[PDB]
Symmetry: D2
Subunit: 416 residues, 4 copies
C-alpha cells in the first residue's frame, strides 16, 4: 500500500503558504449547527477530516457544500441529533457536534470516542459542563445521551483546560438561558477563533483566550461568514523543517501571536527568526543547540509539535529532555526514530534524547498525524532514503506536504 519516500535533501529554502487550521475549522464547522440559516467558512483546508465532519453534518440533515477552500452550511432544517459509531470512530472531533445539537434540540445521542493513537482520552469534562447547564446524561450501549427541558447558564470549573470541553460547552452555552462562566478555560487560539465565529452569528462570548469565558445565552443565532485562522501546527512543522535542514524558509499567511513558544524554543536551539505581520522567516543554525521541552496548555509548548521537536533534537549537539504533560502515550514514534539511528530513552512522561551525528534512512511507519510529519523531517536529513508507511495519518491533517516540501527544494514523493 501507499508510501511516502523521502531522500536526504538540500537545505529547504523559499516560501511556503500555510493552510487554514484543521483544529479551528473542525469546531467552527460543528458551530454552524447552532444557526437557523446559512454560514460561509473561508480558508477551509482541503483535508479528509474536514470532509468527515461535513458528512456528519449531512447525516443530521444540514446542507453542506465545499469548493475551493469555502464551505457553506445551511443548518436551517436539521432533522436528527444522533452521531453514529462509524463517524466518531473515523474522527473523534465528531464529538464536537454534541454541544450544538444539545443546544438546538434539547437532546442529542453521540457515540463515545474509543481508543486513540496518542492516549486514553476521556470526555468526562464535556459531560460535566453539559450537566452543569441542566442536561441529564446517560449511557446506552456505547452512546452518551444528553437531554434537558432547557439549558440554563451556570458557573462550571474545568479540572483541566481541555480544548474540546471548552469548545463543546461554549457552543452549548451560546443558546442557554442566562450566563455561563467557564473557569480554567483552554486559552488556545482555536478557542478565540470559535468565539469570534459564535459572536459573528449573534452570540455573546467574552474572555476567549483568557482563563475565564463568560457566555450570555441568546434565543437564536444566524448564519455568518467567517475567515478561519491559519494552521499554527502546520506553520510550526515547516519552521522545524528549516531548523533541521539548516534551511531558510519564509512561512506565509501565519499569526506570530499563535506561534510564541515554537519561535522561542527554535531561537533557543540557535535559529535566526524574523517575525513579520503575516509571515515568519526561519534560518536554521549550523549546529543545533540541545533544548528541553515540556508540553503544556497554550501558551505553553504545544503537544502537537512535540514529535517534530523531538525529531530535531535527535541530531542536536548534546542531551535534550522532552516531557509530555498533556497526553499519556504520545511517544509511540520513538521506536521509529530509533530505527533511523536516534538515541532516545523513555521513562514515564519523559524522553531523553542524546544527539547523534546523523540519522540513517530506514523503513518506518507513521503512528499518528504529527509523528508522521516528524518522520518526513527525519527523512529530509537522514543519510540515504526513508520509506514511510501508514501515510493516511499524515494525509488526513496536512495539505499537500509533498508539493510544499518539493517547492522548498526537498526530495519527497507519495507512491501508491
Amino acid at each position: 500500500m501507499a508510501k511516502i519516500i523521502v531522500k536526504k535533501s538540500n537545505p529547504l529554502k523559499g516560501s511556503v503558504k500555510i493552510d487554514g487550521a484543521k483544529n479551528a475549522v473542525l469546531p467552527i464547522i460543528a458551530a454552524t449547527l447552532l444557526a437557523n440559516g446559512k454560514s460561509t467558512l473561508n480558508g477551509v483546508p482541503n483535508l479528509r477530516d474536514v470532509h468527515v465532519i461535513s458528512d456528519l453534518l449531512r447525516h443530521v440533515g444540514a446542507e453542506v457544500e465545499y469548493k475551493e477552500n469555502t464551505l457553506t452550511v445551511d443548518a436551517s432544517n436539521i432533522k436528527t441529533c444522533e452521531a453514529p459509531y462509524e463517524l466518531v470512530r473515523k474522527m473523534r472531533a465528531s464529538f464536537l457536534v454534541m454541544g450544538p445539537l444539545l443546544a438546538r434540540f434539547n437532546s442529542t445521542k453521540i457515540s463515545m470516542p474509543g481508543g486513540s493513537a496518542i492516549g486514553t482520552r476521556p470526555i468526562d469534562l464535556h459531560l460535566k459542563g453539559f450537566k452543569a447547564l441542566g442536561a441529564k446524561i446517560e449511557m446506552d450501549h456505547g452512546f452518551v445521551e444528553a437531554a434537558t427541558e432547557k439549558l440554563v447558564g451556570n458557573k462550571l470549573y474545568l479540572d483541566f483546560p481541555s480544548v474540546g470541553a471548552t469548545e463543546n460547552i461554549m457552543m452549548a452555552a451560546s443558546l442557554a438561558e442566562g450566563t455561563t462562566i467557564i473557569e480554567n478555560a483552554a486559552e488556545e487560539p482555536e478557542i478565540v477563533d470559535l468565539a469570534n465565529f459564535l459572536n459573528e452569528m449573534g452570540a455573546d462570548v467574552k474572555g476567549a483566550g483568557t482563563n475565564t469565558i463568560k457566555i450570555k445565552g441568546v434565543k437564536e443565532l444566524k448564519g455568518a461568514e467567517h475567515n478561519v485562522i491559519p494552521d499554527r501546527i502546520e506553520a510550526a512543522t515547516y519552521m522545524v523543517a528549516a531548523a533541521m535542514t539548516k534551511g531558510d524558509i519564509t512561512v506565509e499567511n501565519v499569526l506570530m501571536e499563535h506561534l510564541k513558544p515554537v519561535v522561542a524554543k527554535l531561537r533557543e536551539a540557535g535559529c535566526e527568526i524574523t517575525e513579520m505581520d503575516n509571515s515568519v522567516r526561519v534560518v536554521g543554525p549550523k549546529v543545533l543547540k540541545p533544548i528541553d521541552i515540556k508540553t503544556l496548555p497554550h501558551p505553553g509548548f504545544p503537544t502537537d509539535v512535540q514529535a517534530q521537536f523531538m525529531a530535531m533534537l535527535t541530531v542536536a549537539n548534546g542531551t535534550g529532555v522532552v516531557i509530555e504533560t498533556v497526553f499519556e502515550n504520545r511517544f509511540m514514534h520513538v521506536a521509529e526514530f530509533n530505527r533511523m539511528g536516534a538515541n532516545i530513552k523513555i521513562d514515564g512522561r519523559s524522553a531523553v534524547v542524546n544527539g547523534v551525528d546523523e540519522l540513517h534512512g530506514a523503513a518506518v511507519n507513521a503512528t499518528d498525524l504529527r509523528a508522521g510529519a516528524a518522520l518526513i523531517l527525519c527523512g529530509l536529513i537522514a543519510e540515504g532514503e526513508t520509506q514511510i508507511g501508514e501515510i493516511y495519518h499524515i494525509q488526513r491533517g496536512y495539505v499537500d506536504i509533498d508539493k510544499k516540501i518539493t517547492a522548498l527544494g526537498g526530495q519527497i514523493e507519495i507512491v501508491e
Copy 2:
C-alpha cells in the same frame, strides 16, 4: 518539644477574619528593594517568614520597621547585594531578592536554594530570564552570581508558568532599558498584587494575571503605600474546615475571584457556598461526595490546598483521586493521614483516597506548612485526640490558627 493538641470538635460555626497573603507579601517585600525611598506595606501578616525576609533586607542595608500589620522599608541606601547561605536555607523565598538587587546594582550573589520538604525545586527559569535580560550567570561554591553592564528588555519564554520566576523576572525587568515580554507567565493572584505594587512605585507592567506580561523599564522607582491582598490559601483552609466538620463558617476579608477552583470543588463535594463582596459563607454537607482534584497553575486547583482537600477526601463517601502535577514529592503527609486510619495509596503523582467511616486520633508530625494545617483539620474530626509535632511548619505560615479555630468552636491548644 512543642505540640498542637486537637480533639474531636463541634461543627465549626461563626466568622473568621483572613490575614494578608504570605505569598503576596514576600515578593512585594523583595520589590521594596527596587525603590530609592520609603515604601509602606499594609495588611502584612505577623509570620516568621515575613520576619526572615525582613532580616534579609536588613542584611543588604535597607531600613525595616514592622508594627501592627504595617511594614515600612527604606531602600534608599542599600549597601550590599549578597544573600548568605543561612537566610536562603531558612526560607527559600529569600531567592526573590535576586531580581531587585540585580536591577538596582547590576550585580548580585545569592545562595542557591537546596532541598525542600515538598520537592526538588530548581531555579533554572529565574536564571533563564536574567540571562535573557543580558546578565551573565556563574556559580561559586553554592552561590549563583548574576552581573551585567546593564539590563536590556527582551522577550523570554517560561517553560513552566513558575510563580517565583515570573516575580523575579518582572522585578528585574522593571528597571531594565526597554521592553521585556514574559511569555507563559504565572497567572496567580500574587503576580497581579506584585505588578500593582510595581506600578504604584512608578513601573510600567501590563498583562499581569494573563499569560503574557509586558514590562517597559523605567530609570527609577519611588517608595509607595500598598495594601496586600488577603491570603487565599488561609481562606481555603477555613473553607475546607467548614466542609469537613459539617460546619457553617463565614470567611471575612477575602476576594472570591482568587478562590474560584476551591469554591467549585467544595460545591462539587456538596458544600453550600454563598459568595459575597468581601466574604464567603461555607456550609458543609451532611455527606461529603467524593471528588477528584488535579493540581495545576492558577486558575487550576492550587497545590497549596492539595493536602487539605486530601484530608477532606479521607472521609468522603467513596473514592477520590488526587493528582499532583505542580510538585514532585508533595505526598509526604500521606503516611501521617494513614496513621489516623485513612485509606490512601499512592503511585507516581496520584493518590487514591478510599473514604473511611471516621479518622481516629493519633500522634502525627507536620511535614510542611500546608500538610500540617491538613493534620489540624483531620484532628478536628478524628475520634479522641490528635497530637501534632514539628509545629514550626504550621506556625511559620498561619496566623494564630489555634485562636481562629477556638473562636469557631473547635478544641485546639498549642503546648510548649
Copy 3:
C-alpha cells in the same frame, strides 16, 4: 471486515484443554537453528505467530514441517543469517533468531523492531549481552548487525530481567567458548522450558528459573525432541472467565507452579480454586472482591493477564488499582472498557477501577492480543451484545477461543 460477536452468556461451566505456550514455543523454535540436525517439537499451538517464525526459519534455509501440533526443523544446512524488515515487522519475536544465528555463523543482520501496540520496547539488553560475548554491533538502515571471530563466555548483568534478552543471550552463549553468567536473569517459566530444550540438544545451562543462569558453551548441538509447556496465559484467561461469569471451569493440561500469582489474586477476589497435578478448578464468587494488582517480573503478577484482570475489576464490589510496571503504554484497552460502561481513570502507570453494577454491550476494537481476549470476557457479562473488531490481534495468540468458550456454554461467534 471480521468481527467477534459475544452475547451476555450463561455462567461458564465444564472443562477446557489448554494449548502449548505461544511464548515458550517461539524462542524454542528459534533455538532449533543452533543444531546441525533435526529437532521435533510437540505440543506446538496452531497459531499464526508460530507459522510466521516458521517462515523466518525457511527464509534462512532451515527445513520446517508442521502437522497436528508437531513441528520439525532441520537446521543442518542454514544458508543465510539475515531477518528482513517484513518478518520482524509482522512479529517482533522474530528478533529471537539473532542469538542462534550469531552463535552458528559468527555474523547476523536482523531488522530492528519498531513500534509495538503495548509500548516502546528497545532491544538494547540483547545487544549488551551479544557485545559482552565479543560481538561487534553496528546499525545499517534499520538493521542491527552483530559479528565476531568467536563468541567467548563472559559475565553480564541485565539492567532489567528481560525475558527476550535472557532467551537471546542464553542461545548465543550455548555455543560460545567458555562460561557465560547471566545476572538478574528473567525467571519466567518459558526461560526454564528453553533451557531444558537447549540441554536436550547437548547444551550446559544451569540456574534457569533462578536469578542467575550459567551457560558452559559446547562446540556443537544436535536436534532433539521436546514437549513444550502449556500456555499459562491462555490458562489464566479461562480462569478469569470463570471468576467473571460466576462459573465453574476445570482448566486441563496446566502446571500450577506457573500460575501462582493468578491463583493467589483470584482467591483474594473470592474464587474457590482447587489445584491438581495437571488441572485447576475455578469457581467464581457471587460477589467479586476488589483487589489491587501490580505487574512485575515472574513470579510477580504477569503483565500478559493485566487487561483481563482489569476487565474482572470493572464489576468488582469497590475500587481496585492496577499498576503496570513492565510496559509503558499497556492501557490502550481502557477507552474500549469505558465504551462498555466501565469507570476507569488512568494517570501514569496506574489505573483506578471503580466497580460498576454491570457492563453494557458495545462495538469495541481489540488493541492487542491480551486486551482483545479481555473484551471477549467483558462481552460474556455485558448486557446485550458486544461486537469486537480488529480480531487478528486475538486470533494470532489464542487457539479457537470461539470453540473453547462455546464448549463452556458461552455465546460467541466469529463472523467474516
Copy 4:
C-alpha cells in the same frame, strides 16, 4: 550543630575492612525474640540503629548485652508485646518485632510507621501475611494490633517482593502450625542471613534467596550463635569512592555474590575490579563512562546505592539516567548535588545526570543515610571544601566513615 567537613582529596588507596550488615542484623535481632533461651550474634556493627532495636527488646523484657561487636539476647522471659510510638518513630525497622511477638504470644500491638525521608512506605504486605496465617488485625489510635488463637501456615503472595514483609512473615511462620509458603519473596542476601539464623535456632526454612520460601513451623526455638553477613551497602559505598576518586581500594571482609550488580555497573563505568574470596579490589578509571541505572529488587541494582552512583555520574563523560523503581521520593539529595555544581534534572522516577567537569565544595545537608554518604563522596572530589550538615543521618548507619576514609588517604573530619 555537628558537621562533616570534607576537602578535595587524594585518590583513595589502601584497604578498608567492612562492618557487619545493618540490614541483616536488625531483622536477626528481632528474630532472637522467637527463642526461649540465649542467642549470641557476632559481627554486630556498632551503630545507633542497633542500639535502638536493642532498647526495644529491653522494653518488651528481653535481656540484652552488647560488647565488642557481640550482642547477646535472652528472650526466655519476655513480658509485654507492645512497641510504643517513640521507638518506631526513631527507627522504622522496629516494626520487625511484630512477627516474632505475634508468633511467641499470639498477640502484639505495634505503632504504625509514619513518614520516612525516602517515601511513603506502607506495611500493608506485612499485615496481609499475618492475616493469611490467621491473625485478626485492627487499628487503635496509630497502633496496629494482630491477634490469633493460633498461627496456622498458609500460602500467601506478596504483591511486591518486600524485604521487610518477607522477614516479618518468615519469623511469624517459624512457630506457626503447619507449612507457610511465601510466593514472590524478597531474594535479598539479608533474607538468606535471617533464614540461616532461624534454622540455627531449630526452624525449618527453605528457599531463602529464591522467589519462593517454605517455612514448616516448629513448636519451640532455642537461642543460637550466629555470624552476621558483611554490609554489602557499606562495601558498595567504598567501591564507588574508589571509582569517583580514581583510587585503588581493597574492600575486605565482603561476599562478592552479594555485590554482583554494583561490580557489573562499576566495570561498565570503566573500573578494573578484581574479585577475591573475602575481598574485592577496585581501581577507578581515568575517565568515568556514563552508565544508566535502574533500581530493582535484588539481584537488580540496589536502591541503597542509587544516591552514591548518582554522585559518581555527576562527573561522568556524558549523560546517565537514574531510574528509581523501588522508592517513590528517593531524589531529595538532587538539590544538594546541584548546590555542588551538578547538572541533574528529574521528572517522575527518573533523573537525567549530565556530567560536568568537576564539582565545587558547598554547604549541603544530608537528607537520609545513603544520600549523606553520597555527599561525602562528592566532597572528596569537589574543588575546595564541603560542609555537610544533619550528619546523624550518616552516623546512624556507617561505622566510623571519617576514620575509614582517613585511613584511605582522604581529608574528612567530624566537628561538634
